[PDB]
Amino acid sequence: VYAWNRKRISNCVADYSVLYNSASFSTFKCYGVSPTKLNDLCFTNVYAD
Amino acid sequence: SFVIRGDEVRQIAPGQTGKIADYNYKLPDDFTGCVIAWNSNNLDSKVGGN
Secondary structure, three states: OOOOOOEEEOOOOOOOHHHHHOOOOOOOOOOOOOOOHHHOOOOOOEEEO | OOOOOHHHHHHOOOOOOOHHHHHHOOOOOOOOOOOOOOOOHHHHOOOOOO
16 A cells, blocks of 8 residues: 555546446545536546555 | 346446446436336246246
8 A cells, every 4th residue: 555556547448337337335425526426527647556 | 016136236327328228228318216126036036047
């Protein structure tokens, strides 16, 4: 967690509904955007820290 | 009245996603009522799957 991986994501479709349907995860929190709206929006990049 | 997987109970509210809120059962956004659910594994599961 000190050496946290800053994976840049670019030039791709993201089916964020995978993260809702993969209910095995202990959380799927969001800030500034609703988790539904992720499936509609587009970003210049994403970072998967 | 219906049976579903326990994980999917989250999909039954006003404003939701996944196969139920996608198709299998849709609430309106302004629902006037109550949702009730209970685990039914003893009745609805079987050793060879139901």
